[PDB]
Nucleic acid binder design. Structure first.
Lengths: 125, 354, 196, 257, 299, 256, 257
DNA sequence: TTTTTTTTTAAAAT
DNA sequence: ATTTTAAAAAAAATAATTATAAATTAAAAAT
DNA sequence: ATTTTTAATTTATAATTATT
């Protein structure tokens, strides 16, 4: 299978905000999450405070560096595929703790810093 | 009304008669229970906000549910009840009827006074006091006891007197009534606060007349002269006689005629037309129904006409009543233990009480 | 509706559409070490191959705005040096021990997008440091790895990686495994000799 | 002032290890010919006949017919203070709240006295009669303790039937019927592992099992137990000590409906 | 009468009270704490302290407060309006939101309603001491056997005598006063409730809150959603609530032991039905194992 | 119709003591070539194999292929009735779901019968592979149960490996990492305390511990047990009970 | 390099199983004459020490001194592995943060190389005087332990008393009273049964039953016991061992106004 | 037209 | 100091709902 | 074989509204 990527969906998308759940859910598709998760954000003593299914969620935005702009992608013998949104801000959430330097996703942020270094072309001598 | 402070008297001066048992200690035991004052218990107890629990037909579904679940609470533990219904009230109850009509009249005048006031807890209290039992409650619960097969009786004079009749012939073990005069009527074993809830977890007070007549040192006539001296509902009471001085007075003179022969008429007079002799005759010999004339059997409760009547006429839940009668049937299947005292005589035997 | 994906890519992806209308395309080619299908992205406007790496970690999910997405699938669309995928097909083509032009070097039927690997200028510039005529050289390729390992000795010095196993002389053991995810086990097992 | 001595010391420890799980308080009645304890439990399901005759005592003595109302659990716990060979000696008094229990060493290196309060009791004296029993089954008490202890785990009620060939122990519940046919062993003349059944009427009556675990807790008193059964009578469980006296345990049968 | 602090913030603990009177700033008073909110699956959890001088205990007993378990809501409101007027009757309560108790009892630590109850009780009596209310007697009818509760409260607070028992609303005046204050406070919180989140076609009239109520059950089954379950108003650790979250909502399991209980993993369903799984180091370097990087497979 | 009488069924008592804590409801594979057991545990971690050949019985009747649904805790409490030297017969009906155990006295003094209720459970048999295992260790059962209690006293992490100085049952814990060292081959002619090790490949892998304590409830079955260690497979623990039957236990390792 | 090998550490495993309920955390000391302990309990009521002489150890080489911070539940779970004849060995460094223990076999088959972690605690050694005692009582330790278990269930207090004629174990619980005479059986000459009681002044103190039940848990390492008391001093329960050190167990007396 | 318990503050006499 | 008529008055269940426990419950574990 | 020494079971208090 060959999956062509549409180039018209890169420029016209809208910035938004994204939140990352510290667990898994069985549903993929439409969900009223801005109705509940967004208005229940309380700026407490340790960042951003919210509850989902009774579990306390402490979290904050993790600073994505420039040179790294988030894209939100919808799937669609040649094939096409098409995005819907772009962003630069995502909100990590830990279950009643800030994950911090022990986060596997904050440690995953430095791998494009490695991938800008492991894949630099070596010049000729 | 009733006997004033007889349970208080046993709690004060003769505490060996009380056996504070739990409800599970009668596994396979036959006992007679007053039904009508339990209907009074379930008319003053089963009230929501002062409004009585009724269906859409406008009939009182409170006491049917309450004493149906009472039969479930006795039978799921392993006690077979016997229910007696008070029919014709005795002719000595005229002063008690006059006082009851007077408190009915002042309670209903207080009901209209509180209804004009606009309060609600006083409306709850006065509707708790006012609601009385006619023949509709009695024959509806008689149809209900026909509808499970646990037998029901119609007492000609008094329900606790019929309990005393069926326990003097040994058809049952006890009388489970919070009214005290069945001990004076002749029932040996009383059960007190058996109408308390399962969730209230109140232990049951047992009152044997053997320990009562032993610790009081009295016969039946001296004990009933003591209980008239505390005060009966039928006759009056002497002004100025307490619990303990009446106990000393029965221990001195043993009869009310010798008591008024050896009292002070200048300080302690009897009421006019005082009828302690005929009240004494009525408490020794009331008009009871014969225990051998009725046979005792606890049949399997029929279910389909039970749930038909109970969900059509009374409009209840299917699952609760069906699980209740299933619990009744499997409790009848699995509560078949036999008691050891049925095959022996009884005799007291004390220790060296020093 | 359907499943939904989250990328994290540079903004140089945005300005590579002024020449070709559909000049970006998501394909599957060979893994540089294991040898199976992995999701890559190629360019010919700016002409750099982009590798996509997923953050598939247990018990994470995304709140897409007015939607939901499970799996925690954060995709890392990052630029990749194509020489690992080149050297896989060169060591496949060196098995018969002959020179072979590039049209029939990168040939695979399971991954049918092998036509894309022949259109890159600077192919001979990368091939000079590891090896018209084309024959794979192992010993020249093991000269090229010290220009990549010791480059990442200084590069992960800026990245401040705690490379200790108690979870210069320790970065060499850590950069031993970094390229080993992109070269097979036949090429990295002799690097213990070449770290002296 | 009641004073009693006895030779085999641990027989009292074993019988009050039997009484402690079933009877919580008992009245120790002193007679002229020995000590008798006819008790009946708090739920009217059991009766225990402790005949402790004076022929088995070493130096028995009796001033009057004493009756000590005794809470049995704590004094059974301190009767457990004596050893398996320690000699048990009793001392009492008429106007006293204390019963003296003398525990002494078998080599007499240690002589100890324990006392306890005797909280006075009132016991209904249901008089046992003497009657013919249809199925008198002398049978090992170790085997009986085995059968009741592992028929505890199968259900709640055993049904005991009998015939000429043997006796039946049939316990039911949710987990089927555990019907046990004990063979009448009249062929062997062993003293302990002998099952002898008197054949008068084949009775089929049903019993309890948790309560039977409360009765059968004293197989080192006698190795054999006499089970006397008849039609709708209370059970007789006889724990015969050969010269101390005959201990009898009583259970009412379950009724049918 | 204060309620606007509940309206501006109803996520954590909120304090609703009355100011300290002049005579209670000098006299050693009495203390009483009882419960409302430990019952239902909805609503907040209210513990209250009432306070009154020592000579006024007979006046509080003559105020007809101790019969406050078989009442009606309008009569509760008018008796509340009766005891709010006098200066010697003052009430102080720290209301606990269902957010606060649900985030308490569902952490790493399996926290407890009785443990959080005594923690709220200790913070309440410490704040009552720090407000200038001198007391000597403390009467709490808390749930459980009270001897080790009294020992724990006496070890925490040695200077003030703690006297705790069971079923003490019919025995002590300030216990039933705090009980009826917490009950009318709970009904005030739920009959005038506003949420945190936004809603459409909403219904504030939900029921009494208790799980066997039919209106509460109907609301509890009609406002269930698959992705989030419920708003912040609903407790998330109770058996009816856990029943309908496992029925209607999707399977949500967390990194801790959220009904998973996995130690060691590697089930034999993945060892015998599959003959040999691939032993490839997909996390080839320890960087991708320590940072959770996996190669891409498919879309 | 069943007629399965064994001379001494304390073997059956020991295997149902060894199963009543690990598995609650399981399947007895009933076949004409012996008695087999095959069931996964409560969380699909361990499979059972009691390959009991029917040559030890007096007779063996198996009319049809019975799919036997039995719960083992309650019927283990049933089997605890039997003595150590008792004679045990197993009987079941052909068309009914009812199993009727028979216990018989050694000196024919009683006949003991246990009718007991059952329901039809699911039957899911699986195949078995066989490979030349990396490390096969013959080492006795009682000291194995002792050292599994000892490593259970350590913590909840044990690793098993072999080397040329002997096997190590190395247990790691918050108390401390401890070792149990045995000989490679024992010169003791007494077979109840002899340890010998067959080796093909030394390797170290991590195990669970409560499942190990479930495995070591088969202590009075046999004196010696042969354990064969190999990687990327469940373990094989061959409790060989003479010639009438043998017990096998499986445990897939931990992931590191 | 701290080592301690014993052919049979039965005394070690018995006292280290016994002390698991006395002190939750008891820091040891490294001495020239062996191992040393001086630790108080959690309620600060009872005092215990350990002193083992370095004669019978196989390889006891002492380099310097270090306060061995020892968790006693770690000693319970790490000397619970020792069997009937497991040959113990200790191994440590000069500044090891852990401590390794080796348990070899009589037939050299099994070796249990276990290691325990050390926890750092504040160390204090109270001043304990050594003098001559008012009454020295020597009696069997098994007999002492079983009669301590006997008269501890009767109440909560014990009255100690001794004389030249006998030794009084008086204890008056709320259930009742119980007193034990001991006779001087020095005519009988056994190892533990040779009772030798020397007396100087009859003194009477009160002590605690439940902490004596903790104290009697180290019984069968030493079949004999020496008792020794004076006026208002702690009682010294001496579990002296004829070849491996001694165990002196302390408890302060109560006050009764 | 059909049942009476419980404290308790209470005035009041042996 | 107690003893107590009398006035008044409180005043009365009960399966369902749940969280939180509490002696009970087989069972290791050691005599 | 008992009697510990525990843990993981089965029914226990304290609440509430309705149960109709």
């Amino acid at each position: 299978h060959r999956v062509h990527l549409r180039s018209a969906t890169l420029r016209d998308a809208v910035p938004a905000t994204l939140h990352l759940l510290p667990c898994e859910v069985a549903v993929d598709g439409p969900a009223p999450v801005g109705r509940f998760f967004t208005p229940a954000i309380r700026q407490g003593p340790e960042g951003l405070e919210v509850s989902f299914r009774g579990r306390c969620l402490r979290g904050e935005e993790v600073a994505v560096p420039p040179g790294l702009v988030g894209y939100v992608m919808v799937t669609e013998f040649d094939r096409f595929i098409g995005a819907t949104a772009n962003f630069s801000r995502f909100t990590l959430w830990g279950l009643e703790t800030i994950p911090g330097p022990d986060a596997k996703v904050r440690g995953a942020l430095t791998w494009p810093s490695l991938a800008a270094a492991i894949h630099a072309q070596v010049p000729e001598d | 009304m009733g006997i004033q402070g007889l349970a208080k008297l046993i709690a004060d001066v003769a505490p060996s008669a009380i056996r504070e048992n739990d409800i599970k200690s009668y596994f396979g035991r036959k006992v007679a229970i007053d039904a009508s004052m339990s209907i009074y218990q379930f008319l003053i107890a089963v009230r929501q906000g002062g409004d009585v629990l009724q269906n859409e037909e406008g009939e009182t579904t409170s006491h049917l549910m309450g004493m149906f679940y009472r039969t479930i609470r006795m039978m799921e533990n392993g006690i077979k009840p016997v229910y007696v219904f008070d029919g014709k009230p005795p002719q000595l109850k005229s002063g008690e009827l006059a006082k009851r009509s007077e408190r009915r009249a002042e309670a209903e005048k207080q009901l209209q006074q509180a209804q004009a006031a606009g309060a609600e807890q006083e409306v709850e209290k006065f509707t708790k006091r006012l609601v009385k039992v006619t023949k509709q409650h009695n024959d509806e619960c008689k149809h209900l006891l026909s509808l499970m097969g646990i037998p029901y009786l119609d007492a000609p004079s008094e329900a606790e007197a019929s309990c005393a009749a069926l326990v003097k012939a040994g058809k049952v073990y006890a009388a489970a009534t919070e009214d005290m005069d069945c001990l004076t009527f002749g029932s040996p074993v009383l059960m007190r606060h058996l109408t308390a809830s399962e969730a209230k977890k109140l232990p049951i007070q047992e009152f044997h007349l053997s320990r009562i007549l032993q610790e009081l040192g009295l016969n039946q006539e001296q004990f009933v002269d003591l209980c008239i001296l505390l005060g009966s509902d039928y006759c009056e009471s002497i002004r100025g006689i307490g619990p303990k001085r009446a106990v000393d007075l029965i221990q001195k003179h043993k009869s009310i005629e010798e008591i008024v022969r050896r009292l002070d008429p200048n300080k302690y007079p009897v009421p006019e037309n005082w009828l302690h002799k005929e009240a004494h005759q009525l408490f020794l010999e009331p008009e009871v129904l014969d225990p051998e004339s009725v046979e005792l059997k606890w049949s399997e409760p029929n279910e389909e006409e039970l749930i038909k009547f109970m969900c059509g006429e009374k409009q209840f839940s299917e699952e609760r009543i069906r699980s209740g009668v299933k619990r009744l049937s499997k409790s009848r299947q699995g509560s078949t233990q036999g008691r050891l005292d049925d095959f022996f005589k009884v005799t007291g035997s004390l220790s060296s009480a020093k | 509706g359907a499943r939904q994906h989250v990328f994290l890519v540079s903004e140089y992806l945005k300005d590579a559409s002024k020449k070709m209308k559909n000049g970006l395309m998501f394909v599957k080619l060979v893994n540089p070490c294991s040898g199976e299908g992995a999701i890559y992205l190629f360019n010919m406007c700016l002409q750099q191959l982009f590798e996509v790496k997923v953050f598939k970690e247990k018990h994470h999910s995304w709140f897409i705005n007015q939607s939901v997405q499970s799996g925690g699938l954060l995709h890392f669309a990052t630029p990749v040096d194509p020489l690992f995928l080149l050297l896989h097909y060169l060591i496949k083509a060196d098995k018969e021990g002959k020179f072979q032009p590039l049209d029939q070097v990168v040939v695979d039927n399971v991954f049918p997008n092998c036509i894309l690997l022949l259109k890159l200028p600077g192919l001979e510039k990368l091939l000079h440091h590891v090896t018209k005529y084309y024959k794979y050289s192992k010993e020249k390729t093991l000269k090229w790895l010290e220009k990549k390992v010791n480059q990442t000795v200084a590069a992960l010095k800026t990245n401040n990686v705690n490379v200790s196993s108690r979870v210069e002389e320790d970065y060499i053991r850590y950069a031993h495994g970094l390229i080993s995810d992109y070269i097979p086990k036949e090429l990295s097992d002799d690097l213990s000799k070449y770290l002296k | 002032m009641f004073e009693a001595r006895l030779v085999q010391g641990s027989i009292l420890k074993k019988v009050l290890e039997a009484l402690k799980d079933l009877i919580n308080e008992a009245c120790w009645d002193i007679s002229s010919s020995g000590v008798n304890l006819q008790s009946m439990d708090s739920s009217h399901v059991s009766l225990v006949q402790l005949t402790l005759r004076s022929e088995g005592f070493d130096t028995y003595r009796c001033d009057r017919n004493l009756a000590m109302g005794v809470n049995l659990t704590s004094m059974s716990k301190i009767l457990k203070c004596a050893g398996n060979e320690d000699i048990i000696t009793l001392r009492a008094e008429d106007n006293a709240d204390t019963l003296a229990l003398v525990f002494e060493a078998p080599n007499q290196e240690k002589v100890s006295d324990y006392e306890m309060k005797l909280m006075d009791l009132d016991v209904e004296q249901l008089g046992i009669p003497e009657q013919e029993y249809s199925c008198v089954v002398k049978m090992p008490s170790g085997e009986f303790a085995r059968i009741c202890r592992d028929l505890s785990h199968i259900g709640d009620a055993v049904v005991i039937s009998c015939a000429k060939d043997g006796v039946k122990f049939s316990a039911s519940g949710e987990l089927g019927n555990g019907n046990i046919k004990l063979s009448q062993t009249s062929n062997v003349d062993k003293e302990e592992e002998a099952v002898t059944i008197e054949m008068n009427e084949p009775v089929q009556l049903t019993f309890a099992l948790r309560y039977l675990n409360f009765f059968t807790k004293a197989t080192p008193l006698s190795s054999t137990v006499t089970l006397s059964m008849s039609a709708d009578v209370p059970l007789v469980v006889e724990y015969k000590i050969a010269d101390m006296g005959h201990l009898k345990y009583y259970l009412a049968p379950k009724i049918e409906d | 009468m204060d309620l606007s602090e509940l309206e501006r913030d109803n996520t954590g603990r909120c304090r609703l009270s009355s100011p300290v009177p002049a005579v209670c700033r000098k006299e050693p008073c009495v203390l009483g704490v009882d419960e409302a909110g430990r019952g239902p699956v909805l609503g907040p959890m209210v513990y209250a302290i009432c306070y009154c001088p020592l000579p006024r205990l007979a006046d509080l007993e003559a105020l007809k407060v101790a019969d406050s378990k078989t009442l009606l809501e309008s009569e509760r409101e008018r008796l509340f309006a009766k005891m709010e007027d006098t200066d010697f009757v003052g009430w102080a309560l720290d209301v606990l939101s269902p957010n606060l108790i649900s985030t308490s009892m569902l952490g790493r630590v399996k926290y407890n309603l009785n443990s959080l109850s005594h923690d709220t009780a200790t913070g309440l009596i410490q704040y009552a001491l720090d407000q200038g209310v001198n007391v000597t007697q403390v009467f709490v009818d808390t749930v459980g056997m009270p001897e080790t509760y009294q020992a724990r409260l006496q070890q925490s607070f040695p200077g003030i005598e703690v006297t705790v028992k069971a079923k003490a609303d019919a025995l002590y005046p300030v216990v039933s006063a705090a009980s009826i204050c917490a009950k009318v406070a709970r009904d005030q919180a739920v009959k005038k409730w506003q949420f945190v989140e936004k809603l459409q076609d909403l219904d504030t009239d939900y029921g009494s809150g208790y799980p066997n109520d039919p209106k509460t059950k109907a609301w509890l089954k009609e406002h269930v959603e698959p992705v989030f379950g419920f708003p912040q108003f609903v407790r998330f650790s109770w058996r009816t609530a856990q029943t309908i979250l496992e029925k209607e909502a999707e399977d949500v399991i967390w990194e801790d032991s959220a009904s998973e209980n996995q130690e060691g993993l590697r089930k034999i369903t993945s060892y015998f039905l599959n003959e040999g799984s691939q032993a490839r180091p997909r996390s080839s370097h320890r960087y991708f194992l320590e940072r959770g990087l996996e190669s891409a497979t498919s879309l």
